Amino acid sequence: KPVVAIVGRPNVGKSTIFNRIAGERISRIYSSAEWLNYDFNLIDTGGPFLAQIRQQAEIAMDEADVIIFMVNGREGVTAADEEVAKILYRTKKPVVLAVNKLYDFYSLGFGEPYPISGTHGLGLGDLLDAVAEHFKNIPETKYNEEVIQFCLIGRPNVGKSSLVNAMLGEERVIVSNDAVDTSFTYNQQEFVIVDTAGMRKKGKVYETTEKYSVLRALKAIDRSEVVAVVLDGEEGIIEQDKRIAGYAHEAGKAVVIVVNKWDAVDKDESTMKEFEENIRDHFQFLDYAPILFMSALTKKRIHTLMPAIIKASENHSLRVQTNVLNDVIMDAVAMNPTPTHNGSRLKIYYATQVSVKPPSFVVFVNDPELMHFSYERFLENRIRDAFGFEGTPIKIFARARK
Numbered sequence: 001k002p003v004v005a006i007v008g009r010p011n012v013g014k015s016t017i018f019n020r021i022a023g024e025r026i027s028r029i030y031s032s033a034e035w036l037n038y039d040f041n042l043i044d045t046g047g048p049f050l051a052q053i054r055q056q057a058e059i060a061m062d063e064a065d066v067i068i069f070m071v072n073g074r075e076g077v078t079a080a081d082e083e084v085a086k087i088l089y090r091t092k093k094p095v096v097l098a099v100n101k102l103y104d105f106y107s108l109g110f111g112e113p114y115p116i117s118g119t120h121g122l123g124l125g126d127l128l129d130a131v132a133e134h135f136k137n138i139p140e141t142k143y144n145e146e147v148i149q150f151c152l153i154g155r156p157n158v159g160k161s162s163l164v165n166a167m168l169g170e171e172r173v174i175v176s177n178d179a180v181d182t183s184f185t186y187n188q189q190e191f192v193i194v195d196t197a198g199m200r201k202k203g204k205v206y207e208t209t210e211k212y213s214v215l216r217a218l219k220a221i222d223r224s225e226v227v228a229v230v231l232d233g234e235e236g237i238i239e240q241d242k243r244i245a246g247y248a249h250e251a252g253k254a255v256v257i258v259v260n261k262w263d264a265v266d267k268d269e270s271t272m273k274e275f276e277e278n279i280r281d282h283f284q285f286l287d288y289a290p291i292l293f294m295s296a297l298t299k300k301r302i303h304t305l306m307p308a309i310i311k312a313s314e315n316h317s318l319r320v321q322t323n324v325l326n327d328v329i330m331d332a333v334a335m336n337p338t339p340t341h342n343g344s345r346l347k348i349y350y351a352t353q354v355s356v357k358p359p360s361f362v363v364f365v366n367d368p369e370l371m372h373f374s375y376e377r378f379l380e381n382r383i384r385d386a387f388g389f390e391g392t393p394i395k396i397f398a399r400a401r402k
């Protein structure tokens with residue numbers, strides 16, 4: 001059922017590898033070979049220089065679910081490879097990097113490079129595990145890539161439906177028209193609210209336990225890129241709130257914290273500040289998440305919601321230039337020298353971004369064991385000051401050369 005495409009510039013070995021993994025055409029589409037302990041389909045995308053590659057990658061991004069990006073080892077990172085790379089940045093679909101005919105392929109921004117040789121198929125098993133690992137996250141409801149998908153989550157009666165209503169009443173919104181999702185544009189940009197139906201549940205059904213509502217909300221997050229955590233300003237914070245937010249975080253989604261029912265709280269300057277501090281103390285792992293106070297009922301500050309979601313989404317998607325990132329790491333190191341761990345002091349040789357949604361970074365080191373979690377936090381903070389990243393978690397992995 002899953003579909004795999006091979007993308008690269010010409011003379012890299014696409015046809016060899018492709019013919020190797022292709023079984024027979026179906027009736028262009030080929031299914032996978034018999035020798036593979038893996039079931040999937042391939043799509044051929046082959047037949048100016050930048051304009052023909054433009055066609056291929058486009059076709060893959062629409063048709064394929066997982067894309068293999070092929071470069072040439074013996075040559076290396078050619079500027080021609082760097083162009084194809086730039087094209088593929090245009091997709092939220094998974095890309096695995098293959099290096100044919102076989103160390104700053106990391107400096108192409110797709111993470112670990114999988115060496116192969118279409119000779120006696122060396123390295124192919126690792127390549128296919130990476131490719132296949134994505135098959136489970138293949139969305140069931142598929143939207144256009146320009147669409148920004150988000151969900152609202154929070155306990156019974158926080159005002160999810162009401163916040164939605166209030167959002168959709170603004171002059172800037174045009175609502176369209178799975179009978180679970182709501183589509184609309186805002187400043188003519190496309191959005192989908194995941195699983196609005198689930199918010200409108202009772203009225204056809206008695207909720208009798210929360211346990212199914214929880215699990216369904218988890219599937220809505222899996223489907224989103226931004227999660228609005230909505231808290232009741234009147235009744236405060238509870239245990240269930242931490243858990244669902246916990247999941248969102250561990251899943252690497254952008255997060256915005258929404259405090260609804262602000263109208264129903266005794267407000268002076270202090271109460272807002274204390275409620276904010278309260279949230280930072282209960283949700284210690286969400287410091288990157290901004291906090292919006294509003295009221296779905298009075299419409300106070302409700303016009304701040306969509307801008308914040310747009311911003312969290314952008315930061316979730318952001319790609320840094322490597323040169324700037326390395327300036328920033330080395331600046332962090334100068335200001336704050338690295339710790340020892342028994343005679344041996346951590347050294348950082350180089351950093352690259354390996355992926356987006358959420359942004360992830362690899363720093364090449366001395367030895368990964370020497371990098372304390374607290375120093376990791378510190379490097380994360382320095383990257384935040386330099387680039388922004390409000391509204392998204394970020395990941396830093398330490399790896400050894402070599």
Ligand SMILES: Nc1nc2c(ncn2[C@@H]2O[C@H](COP(=O)(O)OP(=O)(O)CP(=O)(O)O)[C@@H](O)[C@H]2O)c(=O)[nH]1
Binds near residue numbers: 155157201295298
């Ligand atoms: N004071 C105040 N009350 C609100 C606000 N938003 C919603 N309410 C009230 O809270 C109750 C729940 O609103 P509702 O939109 O159904 O919350 P929900 O979370 O969508 C309901 P479910 O949990 O079933 O999905 C309603 O009585 C509504 O009038 C608000 O901003 N301020």
